[PDB]
Ligand binder design. Sequence first.
Ligand code: ATP
Ligand code: ATP
Ligand code: ATP
Ligand code: ATP
Ligand code: ATP
Ligand code: MG
Ligand code: MG
Ligand code: MG
Ligand code: MG
Ligand code: MG
Ligand code: MG
Ligand code: MG
Ligand code: MG
Ligand code: MG
Ligand code: MG
Lengths: 372, 372, 372, 372, 372
Amino acid sequence: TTSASSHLNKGIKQVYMSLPQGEKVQAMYIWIDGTGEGLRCKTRTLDSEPKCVEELPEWNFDGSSTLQSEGSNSDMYLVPAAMFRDPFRKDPNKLVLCEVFKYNRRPAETNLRHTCKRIMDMVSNQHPWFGMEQEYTLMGTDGHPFGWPSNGFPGPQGPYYCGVGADRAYGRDIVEAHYRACLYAGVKIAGTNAEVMPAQWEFQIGPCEGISMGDHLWVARFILHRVCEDFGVIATFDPKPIPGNWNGAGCHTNFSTKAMREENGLKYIEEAIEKLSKRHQYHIRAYDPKGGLDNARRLTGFHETSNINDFSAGVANRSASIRIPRTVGQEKKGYFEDRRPSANCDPFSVTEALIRTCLLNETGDEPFQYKN
Amino acid sequence: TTSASSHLNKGIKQVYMSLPQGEKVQAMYIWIDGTGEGLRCKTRTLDSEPKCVEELPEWNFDGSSTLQSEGSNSDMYLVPAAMFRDPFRKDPNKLVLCEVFKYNRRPAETNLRHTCKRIMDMVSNQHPWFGMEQEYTLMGTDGHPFGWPSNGFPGPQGPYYCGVGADRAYGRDIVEAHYRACLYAGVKIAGTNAEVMPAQWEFQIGPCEGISMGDHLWVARFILHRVCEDFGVIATFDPKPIPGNWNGAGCHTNFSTKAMREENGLKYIEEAIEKLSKRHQYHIRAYDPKGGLDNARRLTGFHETSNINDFSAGVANRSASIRIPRTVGQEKKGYFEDRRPSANCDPFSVTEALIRTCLLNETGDEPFQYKN
Amino acid sequence: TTSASSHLNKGIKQVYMSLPQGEKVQAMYIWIDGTGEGLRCKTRTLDSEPKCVEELPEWNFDGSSTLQSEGSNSDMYLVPAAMFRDPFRKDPNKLVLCEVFKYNRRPAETNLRHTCKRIMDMVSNQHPWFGMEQEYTLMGTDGHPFGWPSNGFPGPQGPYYCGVGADRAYGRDIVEAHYRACLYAGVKIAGTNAEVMPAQWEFQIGPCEGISMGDHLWVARFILHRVCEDFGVIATFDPKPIPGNWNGAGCHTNFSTKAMREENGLKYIEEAIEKLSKRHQYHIRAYDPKGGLDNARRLTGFHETSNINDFSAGVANRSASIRIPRTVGQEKKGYFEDRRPSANCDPFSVTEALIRTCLLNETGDEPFQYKN
Amino acid sequence: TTSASSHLNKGIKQVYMSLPQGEKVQAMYIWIDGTGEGLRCKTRTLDSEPKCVEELPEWNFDGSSTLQSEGSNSDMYLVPAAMFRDPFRKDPNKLVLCEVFKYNRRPAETNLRHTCKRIMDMVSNQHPWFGMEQEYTLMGTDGHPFGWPSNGFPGPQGPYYCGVGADRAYGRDIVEAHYRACLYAGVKIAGTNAEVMPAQWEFQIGPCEGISMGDHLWVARFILHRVCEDFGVIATFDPKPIPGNWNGAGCHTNFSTKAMREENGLKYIEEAIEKLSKRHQYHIRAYDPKGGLDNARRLTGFHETSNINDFSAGVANRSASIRIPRTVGQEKKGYFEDRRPSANCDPFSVTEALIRTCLLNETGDEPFQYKN
Amino acid sequence: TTSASSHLNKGIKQVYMSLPQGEKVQAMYIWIDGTGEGLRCKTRTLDSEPKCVEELPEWNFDGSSTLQSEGSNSDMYLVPAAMFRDPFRKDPNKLVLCEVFKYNRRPAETNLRHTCKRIMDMVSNQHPWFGMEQEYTLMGTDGHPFGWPSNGFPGPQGPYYCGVGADRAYGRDIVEAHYRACLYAGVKIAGTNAEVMPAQWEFQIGPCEGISMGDHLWVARFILHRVCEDFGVIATFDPKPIPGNWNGAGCHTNFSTKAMREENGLKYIEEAIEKLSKRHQYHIRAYDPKGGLDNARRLTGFHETSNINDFSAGVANRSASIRIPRTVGQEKKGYFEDRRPSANCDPFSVTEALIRTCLLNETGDEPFQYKN
Ligand SMILES: Nc1ncnc2c1ncn2[C@@H]1O[C@H](COP(=O)(O)OP(=O)(O)OP(=O)(O)O)[C@@H](O)[C@H]1O
Ligand SMILES: Nc1ncnc2c1ncn2[C@@H]1O[C@H](COP(=O)(O)OP(=O)(O)OP(=O)(O)O)[C@@H](O)[C@H]1O
Ligand SMILES: Nc1ncnc2c1ncn2[C@@H]1O[C@H](COP(=O)(O)OP(=O)(O)OP(=O)(O)O)[C@@H](O)[C@H]1O
Ligand SMILES: Nc1ncnc2c1ncn2[C@@H]1O[C@H](COP(=O)(O)OP(=O)(O)OP(=O)(O)O)[C@@H](O)[C@H]1O
Ligand SMILES: Nc1ncnc2c1ncn2[C@@H]1O[C@H](COP(=O)(O)OP(=O)(O)OP(=O)(O)O)[C@@H](O)[C@H]1O
Ligand SMILES: [Mg+2]
Ligand SMILES: [Mg+2]
Ligand SMILES: [Mg+2]
Ligand SMILES: [Mg+2]
Ligand SMILES: [Mg+2]
Ligand SMILES: [Mg+2]
Ligand SMILES: [Mg+2]
Ligand SMILES: [Mg+2]
Ligand SMILES: [Mg+2]
Ligand SMILES: [Mg+2]
């Protein structure tokens, strides 16, 4: 059920990591590969501790081993974008998230931060805040959910949501370790809870301003994969890991601006929802790395989900595409929640689409090539 | 056998838990679900350490995943009531027990603290003290008592009560860990002992004044479930876990007022017992989350138990419904013990009934609405 | 071969035991049950650390669960007698050895300390010293000696006495842990050695003055049982655990008075041995909880043992019932050793008989009712 | 999951069973014990093969060991009633079903065949025919259904009914062996099929005239238990072995007389249905060995069943209490089916109640005396 | 739990055992060893099949290896007494039960057949008949009953007597093989049944006239041990294999003569029982190979047993020392049953004591030392 690497003696490893480091510093570079969903990493040694992200040098990798580059001109380039403390090696070592560029310095096909950053800079005075709810499922190496009966199923759903106890919550050791690692690293983690499906979990990131939302979620995803690797289990972001009467996985996105958060900001919330109602197909394509096919296995209109074909909005409606919390409606200010994005969405795509539709008043089925 | 989660490498988890936290603080919210027996929890991040319960924010959860609300209006609200230190994450993180309210702010069906608190405030000058003896059995994930022979039975009862040794006491590691965690958290745990059935244990909570009795017992129950989850075993509060000639599980409740604790207070003890003798059926219904059916499997008048049908009382009588300790009768002051409540009773329901019958002079089969 | 409780993750338990305790203090009460050989225990919480044994309150327990009372009037009472530091929970927690009294305050049937203490007060000016050598065998949960071949036997005796090495000494981890725990608790442990039988061991307690010999040996027995519970093995004091050509288990008792320890004290040693020669049957009955039946399986006159029904004494004779060490005989002062008591003897019975015969000049087959 | 006896080398047994018997003949005596549900057996040696049941001698057993008598007059007696060929020992050995009588030669409490034979003799010319469909569940020795995932569940119902394949039929080896064993013995087995719940099966016995129905069903149950003993699994007749969304087990009874089998015999069925409608409570009590404490957990009105408190009828209605097959109504001739009795019913009780209600026109809550 | 030899491939052995033997004949010699309750065997080759026991040659063995002699005149001799067909090697191979004689041609100490045969010849004209019920317990090689839970107990007694099913009968494969093996060999086996304790069984031998009773029972015991050797389990004849509330094992002896079997033979039974009442202590000593130190742990006066120190008799009284069947009393002819002998009794000793007291009118303490 668990990997062979996780059966090695971990006490031996801790003895080596107790050795004082000395003067050199380790930096781990992290980037998104050609599938748009996977992460890659490698480590270099630095002479001294970097104080800001601008002090880190550019790097490179062979793009033919990541299905990102052609044959002859295979070299790709890494440009640091955000820096965090490394929870796996501790201070003064760092984690570095990078943008990917081709040999001719054009952005890579899966490099979506480059365009999203420019869009964020166009509306910086409105101070957009984002909050994302990442759902995932812990799986054994055999392709079955962790802690499930072998070749079988646990009891029916209902007691597992926010559950406590040996027979209710599976794999809380991973969840606790991931929570503390994110806090140490500097990732803005807001909370966690157990989900309807046993061995299914959720963590919230935010509220984050502008481009930082995508950076924090991607690094949080990397930390989860690396923590699960220590325990020998697999975390999956597939929207429908188990077919049938078992809960799916999504990534709800909460959105607000400076105008929405002030008194009588509910008026501006309703304006944005009206604009979103006219671009349902555009956001479905942008909320999936495959264009909507992945989300079709999840958004069928059952198990507290909305239909993939129809747009709906309402106050305190958890079955609609867009939900206004009851407290927000009562206080006439706050935010609203988009429940359409799938659990494997790219945050840079999702946040860029929301700004384009709601703040830049874009129409049609294509993004505006220059600005808005 | 134990759960798959308990076979993960716990040394790995402690490495992550050793990371310094930083400035943010974790708060775990805890509430009682729609069955009136189970507990639920989830965690949010706070900006700074809360000093009192009054400065924690309200929260919410989806009640359709806990069988507490219907479809359209499913949002429920959490209101903090009592705060303790978190033994699983250590200072400055907190545990928060909450009351549950519906979407229209009316109390939930299983929210019995709201009415119990008002009753306790009616008799605050009499200073009621409660002491509760919680019995439970440790279970394997296969539904059999922990440490019992597979598909079989251990030796006859008699050597397991207050026992010591590998062949006499099963699961003392859980008991020791639970005791220390409660002391750290601030729960008023008074003692523990091994019970007549092997793998059966007991811990005592009190003496607690007023509404704080229910708060301390529920948090103690939560800590036990969470501790057992680490070891991979299940703690059950079922009154009769094993049929036949094996000891059952109850929750004895000790009761005293300021008048009973003073000299010649035995007179007021005798008066309260007389009032209790006239309301046997009312207390049987209130001492069970199912109206008394659960307690029928345990209270059959055998193995040092009282009859479910009959009321009896006496000094130093462990076979009666109400027992006056021999010391209390000798010093003519003290308290008395109600031995009827089952091990899965709700403390808020049990304590409210005692106040209504003994201090508010209520009669009939229904509680008196507003005042007494 | 070992218990299910011992396969739980002990690292998890140590995390909880690392939590700072706070202001409250745990006290474990220990007493002897109705079989005269087994120990019982339970824990209560105190508000502050007790400084002397007189500050601890009286307690009680249900005697019908320990075969010490039946029917009505089954409550028993515990009176603290001696206090030690708790090695399992560390300072400021305490272990408390108690005397048992029935509901009418008469001493219980197996409470032999009450009479033994009064006898020791009658000879206080002679300062009797006692030293006892407790032998025991470590056993697996399957009823076979620990580390022995399954359904088989190890090699013949001879290399195991005071042995070192994986093939010579079984279970030294328990012996080392028990030694350190006794030193921490304050028990006057004098040494240990491996015995002729593999997995058989011995520890020495003393020299102890008066009634303190019984208190120290009983607490050492409890500590041994509790330590073995941690490792998942059973320690047995049965005189002949394995039938045939395998070493038995005894409890040799060394005795001396102030006159015996002074120069030319060998004269008073010979006087006491002369008195002992006339009361062989009386001491055989008092050296066993069954009146001598258990010791019959051991004292057959083989394997360096004396005959059960014959009395003998000599200098440097290890086959006699009473042995005078050669050093003592050469220096004309010291002590002497009684080799008759079985390994499961009650120390209060053994010490009381020695005082009555040697210092109070009692005759007949019954103890003198009043003083002397 | 399987018994220790099933892990013995079965090839060794087959060698001994191939030895020629000689001239002696074995005979196995079977009778119903004091619970009214289980069976008991023992073997004796006869000098020659009996040609009919009337040549078998009487026997006896100890009734105190079977919970059928006290210690004063414990002896009970066995009178053979029906003979069958032995499928476990082959010819010329026999199985004999016996009636149980007290020491005073009066029928035992669970001996329901005596009165049923007397009742059935009174309607001989009508030639009543019976056919019963017996359902059962195969269980491992751990108390879980055989082949189910450990501490878990298989997929939801729907593919298991009459299924074929490793993932659809659990334990067909037992079913095939039982079918062939019954045919060899002379049991009138009509067919088998796999049931809705996995590891649940059904066999049909009949049409058997008169008292012969109870003899054939009881022997078939004994053969099933004995066959399952060879494989090491347990056959259970519980009405609801698994709680929840899983099918229960019943024993449908098919009834017809000569009149209903003749031309236009459908009209004689209608009076039988009409007569049965007024005695629903009386028949429910006689359809359960525990008076209704078992069938109450199956007849819940769901899973295509009928409610325990309501009587229904109709042509080709499987949800009613009584079903008339569609072909029977089309041909206006045949039988009708009673779906009320549980799987653990006594066939003698069921057949007697049907005869005395539809053929003797009995009323009231008590069986008629010599008047009927 | 089973022997290493039983895990060898038994299919390989059956291949060799199917080879045609040829003209040589195997004969196995069986005799009782120096302990008086164990058996020994040895095999030799004969030129042709013996037609009767009288043409089997005498043999010999080493008595020092069997502890029936010292190292000076260790040689002993075997004289054939009874011949049986070999069930383990099939025809024409044979089993031979032999008497043991010293080097000086005098009977061995445990050779009780020699004197018993002379006693039977004295009263041969009355044709005494004997029938013995031999009880035994099946054990694993670890010293625990076969099929019992590891280091534990099954459910309480009551369903195991004459039970059927995987959870009620333990090890019926051995019982079925032994029954068929005895019939093939010519042993007069009368029947079998399961006993009160699980894994405990019984078989009956008789009615056997005179000296043949001891021959048939001893061969039956040998066949059981040899059959159990094939399966890898141990059959024990200990009177009290498991201490506590678990049934013991005895060897009930049924006795009758021609007068008792004739008309009005009940009056002759009363004389024998009256004569038996006087020599209770004499028979108790002769009913135990250890003189009474084995049967003392069974005849406790509980679990339907008679106290070893009390003689009692009565019609159909299973708690008495002597039982008269109810049918015998009603028919005034038959036999009577002696319930005193233990399971490990010597049939020659038991049958000789019954003849001496009831038929020869002997009295006193020691047997008559001359023929007349
Ligand atoms: N003003 C805001 N602007 C943007 N995001 C916000 C704002 N306020 C809160 N959020 C984010 O909204 C999210 C709240 O989601 P949470 O999981 O706590 O509740 P929920 O949506 O009611 O739950 P569920 O999982 O049942 O849908 C968090 O990620 C938080 O950071
Ligand atoms: N004055 C008091 N008022 C209320 N509760 C009290 C008072 N004094 C003590 N108690 C409570 O009474 C309980 C004592 O019960 P404990 O389990 O120690 O003994 P017991 O009832 O005699 O034992 P058993 O488990 O055999 O019934 C504790 O929970 C304690 O807090
Ligand atoms: N003066 C004394 N009075 C009483 N006891 C004493 C005195 N001096 C020593 N002792 C005790 O005598 C005991 C000696 O036991 P020890 O195991 O050393 O004996 P040993 O001679 O090696 O014998 P063995 O081979 O039987 O174990 C110790 O318990 C010690 O405390
Ligand atoms: N005339 C008859 N009288 C009595 N019993 C009959 C008669 N004809 C057939 N039977 C019996 O009725 C039974 C028919 O059961 P069967 O399970 O085959 O029917 P069904 O309608 O498919 O049942 P199910 O409720 O399981 O779907 C058989 O045992 C058969 O012997
Ligand atoms: N006339 C007789 N003389 C001697 N033995 C006889 C006679 N008739 C029968 N027997 C033998 O008596 C034995 C009866 O044993 P069986 O177990 O059937 O008796 P039971 O009364 O049921 O006793 P229990 O309940 O104590 O086992 C058989 O071995 C049988 O051969
Ligand atoms: Mg959420
Ligand atoms: Mg959400
Ligand atoms: Mg208590
Ligand atoms: Mg109590
Ligand atoms: Mg020593
Ligand atoms: Mg010594
Ligand atoms: Mg059918
Ligand atoms: Mg049917
Ligand atoms: Mg018998
Ligand atoms: Mg008998």
